[PDB]
Subunit: 337 residues, 3 copies
């Protein structure tokens, strides 16, 4: 992580990341069964286990509608079965509950569709070099969050669904992020604003550079950006001379000339850009002293650790997160009997 | 709420909203610990409580993989423990269940990570004036949704996670929404369409106006828009003369000249725009009478309460939501024995 | 499904789909009430049912904060109530659980807010012709997903919420998808790239064509695209001569001329586009033999069934999903006593 301030265009580039990109989809098929329940002597009467079985049977029947392939007297013994049924058959119930809640597909691969043991084995079988496989196992919280389970169908008392794990093929390719703010000059009152429109992520692969334009498109897990190959716009590798020289007469860079000053604050990974002109007062302050200085009229770059808040005409911006309070909560004890 | 129809460009502007913008992030750290279970004689022999404990231990162990800090016989007394364990330790299990379901992070702050009592106290401690704090307490429903919990790690039988509440610094700043439709003139069979491209929200703050271009970006809660400061494009405060005069020779407004007529319907907050030319028949009708009139060839604005359905060549559009049926459902009674 | 390769612009169009568009919103109001529990003698002394009731009361009280209307010893008989209470009042608890988890609104209509019997009846009452109603019943999986429940408020022991089902008015209107890749010509070492910008979905309705520009906007369910009428950009029906002839002097097609070659792979529904120039070696290989051939320098279209992997300078792309392993899992049996 190393953020550089470019004063000729009022923008910053942070080049310390490594890119991991998806290059296909894996697939596993699961079949979860309810499990045998010992026969009841009565077989026709209201019992806690029978009511529990009926609810499970009814839940499966309703769940069959949201599919993809085909459709679209108290006794001590009874209590033990009712509790035992919901304990031994817990993974099955959770899968049924999750699919019903999301109505067909879960947003992410929870730890009930595919346990860790099944996840590690699946990753090791993917068609990628050893380098990619090692990285995926190191941080498997992202493969789960990038996949999505799909319900195939329901037959009898079993459930069939697909996981569709992601597959990463390009890893450890250096890349950066670019943030820009307006840079308006002035002669006698008539301004000339130049704002760079090539703002967002920027990562390289396969002899080309991708341009995920939304900061939310690519997640961050330290020195790793888990970009999704669904919004990236491929651009020529020559689209880097803009940083060195905005014009450079070589690669036309996307800029938007203006005529009216704009005052705004843009937050960077390790700082923020403060630009304000002609009317609004700017100042940088911390949680200790809020009178550090008044920013001069222009585009100024302030480090994250140098200041904590920037007030653009009575509007704090909180460069960095603010820590609150820590709580510790413990449940009540479960005494015998 | 007051919608105005501008006939020189076939667009409408609604000026009745108040803006609420985010200016940072808060943070709280929680540590939920499982309750204490009294020593059980004959730990070797299975029991309905040992099985429940084993499932909890297994669930926590799997949950450790998706983290961020380090990784990535039955007696009457026995039954009470199984029921009691899941009752006293209800908050802990729900937090474990939610994190496992979403695989590491919960999309919103449910009412198990942070109860109302904890949420109210945290909001009162934020670094914002009394005005902002009062508003957040008044409607805390749109605080949990904008936030998101993060699982830090799992150690022993305890779970550590972060909430990261949002912080609002700019409130009660009036703003509006602009919707536009094509306005094509006819000249001896030759058309000239002019469709505005500055369509979306438009809110003001810190001597500038933001331009969230997607209606889904900002969520409305009456006379309040909880816009997210992640897609807003800052624009000059002079970007308002377009409504008064499309050209105005002052702020170049984004328009897209065309040559072929386009027939479409745009739904405004309190009405809709109906444009249809050269071939498709327009008509406005209600659920009572559907022959109110036939709209003339051109851009026309119809109030929400004036009509309910707009048919563009046999395609009803349902200006406003249609109410269905109300159901009342009660669960079966529970009787002793 | 029929994919055509257009060599004059290095793009492909697939014309085999049928459109399904939303034209309003439906609405149902539900009121779920907790069941009646027979009064238990000695309410003062704790019991496994009183604790269960207290948790339910506490859960409802907290849920009241996230609303929209107003705010923002153990015996054998006792155990049966605790188990029976959570069985009969299963739908109510699930609705409470879902609303609390999502903090006010559920992303989709799970199978606890509206059962299939209620959903089928509601769909039959929508104000649409018999043709639209028949389609919605046939595949109701993509009705719950497009809808979303809303919690109105909590009064006493009852819960009131709204479902807001979607309504489809335009069906069986043929439409297609267009994917394009750079087509750079070489002239004495000087390149001239032409990449189409009219990339995405393209569906027709009401004498106009919509242009959902994101592949994720429209979800495919076979020969049906359930596009959401929230991002569609209406375009003239004459915006189709681009495929036949790029210029055609009638509808200016959106292209972006360039000067530097770009190498990339675009995945079409039934194939992919491979373009690579001046430095990176292309090759197509299957899971059987990976030396099928080396693609020549240019824009080439390869069928999905012809090859499985595309390597752009040591980067496999996995044209089609790769099948993994199938698991069958059964829960432990439950035996009496
Ligand atoms: C950035 O690029 C501009 C554009 O080419 C450079 O300005 C040119 O510099 C050359 C000298 O190498 C002159 O012959 C041209 O007349 C200049 N043109 C213009 C429009 O200024 C500039 O030198 C480059 N470097 C910097 C720091 O701006
Ligand atoms: C909107 O702006 C246009 C452009 O400035 C105005 O049209 C001009 O009006 C002045 C009179 O003040 C004339 O001297 C110019 O010749 C006009 N130019 C053009 C291109 O029309 C227009 O009057 C303004 N008002 C309205 C309602 O359009
Ligand atoms: C595609 O459109 C272009 C543009 O009109 C056509 O090129 C023209 O063809 C006419 C013949 O009908 C000539 O008189 C013009 O001089 C051509 N103009 C240019 C710029 O080439 C072209 O023939 C059409 N068809 C194809 C296959 O490109
Ligand atoms: C239980 O009884 C049913 C009654 O039809 C029978 O089919 C089944 O084989 C018996 N055993 C189990 C384990 O369900
Ligand atoms: C059981 O007793 C032992 C005695 O050392 C103690 O270490 C252990 O924590 C106890 N277990 C429970 C569940 O109370
Ligand atoms: C139970 O007793 C209460 C008195 O506290 C009474 O209000 C209620 O009607 C009785 N019946 C119930 C709870 O079913």
């Amino acid at each position: 992580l190393k953020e550089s301030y470019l004063e000729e265009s009022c923008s910053t580039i942070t080049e310390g990341y490594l890119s991991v990109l998806r290059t296909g989809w894996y697939t596993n098929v699961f079949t979860l069964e309810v499990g045998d329940v010992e026969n009841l002597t009565c077989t026709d009467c209201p019992s806690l286990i029978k009511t529990e079985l009926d609810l499970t049977k009814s839940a499966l029947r309703e769940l069959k509608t949201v599919s993809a392939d085909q459709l679209a007297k108290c006794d001590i013994a009874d209590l033990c079965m009712a509790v035992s049924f919901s304990q031994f058959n817990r993974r099955f119930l959770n899968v049924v509950r999750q699919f019903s809640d999301n109505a067909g597909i879960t947003p992410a691969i929870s730890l009930d569709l595919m346990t860790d043991a099944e996840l590690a084995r699946a990753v090791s079988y993917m068609p990628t070099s050893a380098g990619q496989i090692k990285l995926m196992l190191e941080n498997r919280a992202m493969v789960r969050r990038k996949g999505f389970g799909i319900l195939i169908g329901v037959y009898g008392s079993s459930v069939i669904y697909m996981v569709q794990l992601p597959i990463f093929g390009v890893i450890d390719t250096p890349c950066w992020i670019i943030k820009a703010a307006p840079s308006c000059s002035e002669k006698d009152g008539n301004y000339a604003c130049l704002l760079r429109e090539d703002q967002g992520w920027y990562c390289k692969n396969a002899g080309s550079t991708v341009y995920y334009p939304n900061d939310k498109d690519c997640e961050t897990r330290g020195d790793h950006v888990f970009c999704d190959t669904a919004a990236g716009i491929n651009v020529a590798e020559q689209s880097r001379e803009c940083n060195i020289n905005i014009s450079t007469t070589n690669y036309p860079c996307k800029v938007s000339t203006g005529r009216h000053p704009i005052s705004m604050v843009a937050l960077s990974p390790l700082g923020a850009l403060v630009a304000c002109y002609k009317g609004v007062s700017c100042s940088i302050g911390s949680n200790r002293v809020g009178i550090i200085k008044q920013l001069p009229k222009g585009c100024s770059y302030i480090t994250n650790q140098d200041a904590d808040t920037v007030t653009i005409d009575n509007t704090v911006y909180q460069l960095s997160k603010v820590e609150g309070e820590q709580h510790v909560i413990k449940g009540r004890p479960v005494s015998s009997s």
